[PDB]
């Protein structure tokens, strides 16, 4: 399938080379996942999510997205026009207040609540949850997100937008889930990325399009934008029956355009995120 005049990111995704702006993708689009976005929340209503999202939990007095972090997180993952997997399942988990912020007690049980709650749903192709969160080290925060991942969930996690080595940072620092750098449309390293050994993959992350609460969309950047590529990704190779839970990082990362950003500091990878799709 091609999508034309598609954002950059989607475009990049699928592509040997930066400057284009069509995205191809195989149409089974991951169709039969499940991608939980932890988060502020996510604008389910928007029609832009085809009825393909929904909340299952809030720690706060409502689950709707108050802030637009989260919905345009969730349409990166997959709404019709700006999401990579376009008929996977959307699954809010509002840990973050409408001011974007969270206490790790609430962000850890909400890990936890997801590596449970898969179970009551119907994900035959696999489930992923992408974390567009973090701050400080922290074993806790860390150890969650190892649980979740364990449990059979792919974890994707963003590095951080702090121009730094991301094991100062959780839960970026946690080696066995995929930690996620940003990258722009020239595919120079963005210029908040973290980096560091514990990176596992870059995604787009500069200027990036995506779903916005009031029905809206707009363009932002962060490390935030592009953990979601990575995590519907995960989505769209586990539908094919490439990979699975377990091995997507890796196999992302196997796949993954080699050598070809810009200010990648010595000693971390130089790989972006690559779908392989041959139309």
Same mark, same amino acid.
């Given at each position: 399938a ?14 040997? /080379?930066?400057g284009?702006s ?5 149409? %089974?689009?991951?169709? +039969?996942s499940?991608?939980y976005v932890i988060?502020?929340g996510?604008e389910?209503?928007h ?11 809030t720690?706060?007095?409502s689950?709707?997205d108050?802030?637009?972090? +989260?919905?345009?997180?969730a349409?990166?993952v ?6 990579v997997?376009?008929?996977?399942q ?7 207040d409408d001011n974007? %912020?969270?206490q790790? %007690?609430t962000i850890?049980?909400?890990?936890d609540?997801?590596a449970?709650?898969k179970n @009551?749903?119907?994900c035959?192709?696999?489930?992923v949850a992408?974390?567009? &969160? ?7 925060? @860390?150890?969650?997100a *190892?649980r =979740?991942?364990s449990?059979?969930?792919?974890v994707?996690?963003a590095?951080? #937008?702090? #121009?730094?080595?991301?094991?100062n940072?959780?839960? $970026?620092?946690?080696? /066995?889930?995929?930690t ?5 449309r020239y595919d120079?390293r ?6 560091? /050994?514990? &990176? ?8 990036? =399009?995506?779903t ?10 962060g490390?935030?934008?592009?953990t979601?590529?990575?995590?519907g =990704? *995960?989505?769209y190779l ?5 990979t699975?839970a377990?091995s $997507?990082?890796?196999?992302?990362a196997?796949?993954?355009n080699?050598?070809?950003?810009? #200010?990648?500091?010595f000693?971390?990878?130089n790989?972006?995120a690559?779908? @392989?799709?041959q139309?």
């Amino acid at each position: 399938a091609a999508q034309t005049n598609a954002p950059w990111g989607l475009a990049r995704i699928s592509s040997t /080379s930066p400057g284009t702006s069509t995205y191809y993708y195989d149409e %089974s689009a991951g169709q +039969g996942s499940c991608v939980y976005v932890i988060d502020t929340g996510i604008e389910a209503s928007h029609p832009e999510f085809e009825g393909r999202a929904q909340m299952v939990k809030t720690y706060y007095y409502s689950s709707r997205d108050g802030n637009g972090h +989260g919905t345009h997180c969730a349409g990166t993952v997959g709404s019709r026009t700006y999401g990579v997997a376009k008929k996977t399942q959307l699954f809010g988990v509002k840990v973050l207040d409408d001011n974007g %912020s969270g206490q790790y %007690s609430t962000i850890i049980a909400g890990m936890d609540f997801v590596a449970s709650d898969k179970n @009551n749903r119907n994900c035959p192709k696999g489930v992923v949850a992408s974390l567009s &969160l973090g701050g400080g080290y922290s074993s806790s925060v @860390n150890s969650a997100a *190892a649980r =979740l991942q364990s449990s059979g969930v792919m974890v994707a996690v963003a590095a951080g #937008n702090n #121009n730094a080595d991301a094991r100062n940072y959780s839960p $970026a620092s946690e080696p /066995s889930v995929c930690t996620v750098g940003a990258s722009d449309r020239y595919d120079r390293r963005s210029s908040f990325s973290n980096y560091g /050994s514990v &990176l596992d993959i870059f995604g787009p992350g500069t200027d990036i =399009l995506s779903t916005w609460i009031g029905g809206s969309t707009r363009s932002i950047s962060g490390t935030s934008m592009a953990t979601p590529h990575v995590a519907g =990704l *995960a989505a769209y190779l586990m539908t094919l029956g490439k990979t699975t839970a377990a091995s $997507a990082c890796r196999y992302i990362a196997d796949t993954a355009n080699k050598g070809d950003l810009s #200010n990648i500091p010595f000693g971390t990878v130089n790989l972006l995120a690559y779908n @392989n799709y041959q139309a």
